XYZ file of N, CA and C in Angstrom:
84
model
N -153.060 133.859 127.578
C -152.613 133.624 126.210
C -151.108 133.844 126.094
N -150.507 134.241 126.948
C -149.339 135.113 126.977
C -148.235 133.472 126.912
N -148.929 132.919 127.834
C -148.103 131.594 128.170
C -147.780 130.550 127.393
N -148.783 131.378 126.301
C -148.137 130.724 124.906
C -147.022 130.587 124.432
N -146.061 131.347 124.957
C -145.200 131.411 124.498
C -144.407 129.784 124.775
N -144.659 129.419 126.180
C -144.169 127.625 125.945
C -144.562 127.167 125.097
N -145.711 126.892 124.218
C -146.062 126.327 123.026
C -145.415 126.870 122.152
N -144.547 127.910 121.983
C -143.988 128.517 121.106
C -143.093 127.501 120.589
N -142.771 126.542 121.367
C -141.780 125.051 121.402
C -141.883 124.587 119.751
N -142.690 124.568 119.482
C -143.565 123.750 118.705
C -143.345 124.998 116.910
N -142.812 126.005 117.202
C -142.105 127.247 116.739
C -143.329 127.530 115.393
N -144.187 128.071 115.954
C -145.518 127.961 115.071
C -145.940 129.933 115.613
N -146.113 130.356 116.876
C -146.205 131.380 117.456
C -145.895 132.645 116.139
N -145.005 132.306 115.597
C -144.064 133.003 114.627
C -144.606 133.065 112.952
N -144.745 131.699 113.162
C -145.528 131.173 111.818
C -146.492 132.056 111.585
N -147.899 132.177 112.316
C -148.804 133.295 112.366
C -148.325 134.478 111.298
N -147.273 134.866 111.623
C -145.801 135.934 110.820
C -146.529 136.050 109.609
N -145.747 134.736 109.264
C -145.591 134.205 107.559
C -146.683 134.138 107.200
N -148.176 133.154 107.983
C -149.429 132.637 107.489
C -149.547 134.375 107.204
N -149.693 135.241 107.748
C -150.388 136.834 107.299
C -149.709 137.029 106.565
N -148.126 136.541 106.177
C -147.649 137.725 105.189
C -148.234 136.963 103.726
N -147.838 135.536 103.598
C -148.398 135.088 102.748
C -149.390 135.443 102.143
N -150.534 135.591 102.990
C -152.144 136.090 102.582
C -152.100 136.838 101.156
N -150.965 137.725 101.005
C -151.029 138.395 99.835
C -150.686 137.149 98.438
N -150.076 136.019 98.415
C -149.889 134.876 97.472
C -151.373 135.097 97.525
N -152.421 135.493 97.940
C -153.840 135.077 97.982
C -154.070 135.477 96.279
N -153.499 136.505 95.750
C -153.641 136.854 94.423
C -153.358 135.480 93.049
N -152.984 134.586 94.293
C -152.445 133.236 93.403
C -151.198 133.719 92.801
């Protein structure tokens, strides 16, 4: 999984970040 990080290309790896921090907008 580690080797993900070449797909990281694609600069999404990071995103994950945001998709969790977001979660709290979950309150709408």
């Amino acid at each position: 999984s580690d080797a993900a990080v070449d797909t990281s290309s694609e600069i999404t790896t990071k995103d994950l970040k945001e998709k969790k921090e977001v979660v709290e907008e979950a309150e709408n």
